[PDB]
């Protein structure tokens, strides 16, 4: 165990056989600084206030994904193709701030103990899939090497609207819904 | 369910007391098993599991690999601290303190940063401890935290309850009141 005032992940490198596919992000004290959109080859800073201006060439991540891709194939042989174990994710729903009907807020759906890093997180309003007004963090890292993801939903609390968070994962026998209402 | 295989490479920088003590660590992980690692405190690569022995012995032989790993504390950690972390560590977001019943009273302290926080309960200026229950710190994921701290209580007509909050972004504590309905 390492004791320190602060800890940064200037290199959370993920690559998995399913896809195949990977992810590159930097973290500071547990929060996401940025991620590199691997398809568009662009650096995506999540919050321009946590983007203490210093540029990051997207190329540094593609390069690192190559090594990861190569390294995965090597380790698969070295580990006699031992498959990954689907963990059972735990979902929890809560509001950003206190709820005052007729006031703009945000519901947060935390999906913890995720593994492997493949999951579907969508919202439901009275049973209907809430297409937009949604957002998501990348797969954030955990010291036990599993991941956690956080989904957001901006909304106006009312008496005629209930909500749910739908999470689909191989570690679940069926879609799991977490309920929430004013 | 489709079978899967996962690889993880984590580049970590640990900081203590500004930048006086810096420590860098890289971890290679297959699925959920860290098999090899380089810890600047140790100085060379180390197998963490049997499958990492070959890797460590080979990389420790290569003069470039080893020297590069040792130069990481400066080329990456100390470098990034100057370029971005020092600045991020200046981020301050004051907490929002609100009280509301649910006989429980809830001090909902929300939207703050950094994590350091002190929350006390008071009934007529005397601190309440027995009867107080607090959740752990909650990470919103958007660079802000929140924390709920409940108080078991039985209301009387003249009592004044106060939620007292201190945070590094506050020149003076915030105090929100609540009086018997």
């Amino acid at each position, epitope marked *: 165990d390492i004791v320190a005032d602060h800890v940064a992940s200037c290199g959370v490198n993920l690559y998995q056989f399913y896809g195949p596919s990977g992810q590159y992000t930097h973290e500071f004290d547990g929060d996401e600084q940025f991620y590199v959109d691997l398809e568009r080859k662009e650096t995506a800073w999540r919050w321009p206030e946590f983007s203490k201006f210093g540029g990051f*060439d997207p190329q540094g991540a593609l*390069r690192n994904m*190559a090594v990861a*891709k*190569h390294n995965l194939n090597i380790m698969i042989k070295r580990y006699n193709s031992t498959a990954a174990t689907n963990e059972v994710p735990e979902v929890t729903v809560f509001s950003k701030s206190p709820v005052t009907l007729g006031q703009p807020n945000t519901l947060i759906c935390l999906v913890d103990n995720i593994f492997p890093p493949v999951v579907n997180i969508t919202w439901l309003s009275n049973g209907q899939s809430v297409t937009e007004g949604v957002s998501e963090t990348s797969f954030l890292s955990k010291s036990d090497h599993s991941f956690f993801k956080i989904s957001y939903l901006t909304f106006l609390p009312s008496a005629d609207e209930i909500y749910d968070c739908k999470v689909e994962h191989w570690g679940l026998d069926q879609p799991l819904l977490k309920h929430w209402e004013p | 369910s489709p079978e899967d295989f996962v690889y993880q490479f984590k580049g970590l920088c640990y900081f203590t007391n500004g930048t006086e003590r810096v420590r860098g660590v890289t971890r290679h992980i297959y699925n959920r098993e860290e098999y090899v690692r380089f810890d600047s405190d140790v100085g060379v690569y180390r197998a963490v599991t049997p499958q990492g022995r070959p890797v460590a012995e080979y990389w420790n032989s*290569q003069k470039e690999v080893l020297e590069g790993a040792r130069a990481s504390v400066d080329r990456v950690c100390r470098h990034n601290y100057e370029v971005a972390y020092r600045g991020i560590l200046q981020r301050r977001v004051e907490p929002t303190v609100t009280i509301s019943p649910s006989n429980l009273l809830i001090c909902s302290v929300t939207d703050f940063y950094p994590s350091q926080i002190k929350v006390r309960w008071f009934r007529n200026d005397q601190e309440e401890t027995a009867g107080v229950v607090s959740t752990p710190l909650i990470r919103n994921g958007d660079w802000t935290f929140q924390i709920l701290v409940m108080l078991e209580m039985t209301p009387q007509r003249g009592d004044v309850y106060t939620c007292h909050v201190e945070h590094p972004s506050l020149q003076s504590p915030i105090t929100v009141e609540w009086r018997a309905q």
Partner: T-cell receptor
Amino acid sequence: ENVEQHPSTLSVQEGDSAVIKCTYSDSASNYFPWYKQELGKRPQLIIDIRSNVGEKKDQRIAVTLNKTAKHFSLHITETQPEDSAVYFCAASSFGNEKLTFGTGTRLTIIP
Amino acid sequence: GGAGVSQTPSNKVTEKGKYVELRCDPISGHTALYWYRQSLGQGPEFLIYFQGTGAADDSGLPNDRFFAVRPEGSVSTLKIQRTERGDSAVYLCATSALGDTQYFGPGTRLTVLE
């Protein structure tokens, strides 16, 4: 991006000195190697310099760097016939390890 | 590989439309391998960059008729299909222990005739 190299051709008397100047565009550049190439042969790495030093000498060869101005030069002193060849400067960045070369300079040392 | 990066043969002459393959045996140990193209009068220009078995950067590939491989993070092969007169140039190969300091091979001059 762009590495500008001058002069395109150079003729110098055996014994005299030769200088090749280059200007790069990306300030992110941190590695500046130099290559010597002989007819029908590949480029050979002869010397390099990183953004953390302004000068570096190695025998008859010398290279300089000015990060602020984005100029880096090559110095061959006391040139000898074997120095006749085409030279190239190049630039690399911490994040992009691919090299972007200059147009080259055909150096001819008159015996 | 050996002490230096090898590229044989030094010359390959063919005509428009044929299929051509160029091989590169890297310096033993080097994990990074590049391919560069050189039209004479000019300096080398980037084509593709390999880290181990996979491509880390293939932005330099002129068009879809070019494709390279390094099935074992060792010897690499640049394949060109339905060759065109405009593909004539010297194809240089370079390897690096980690990626930055690059060492070139003798190169292979590809001459495509009508």
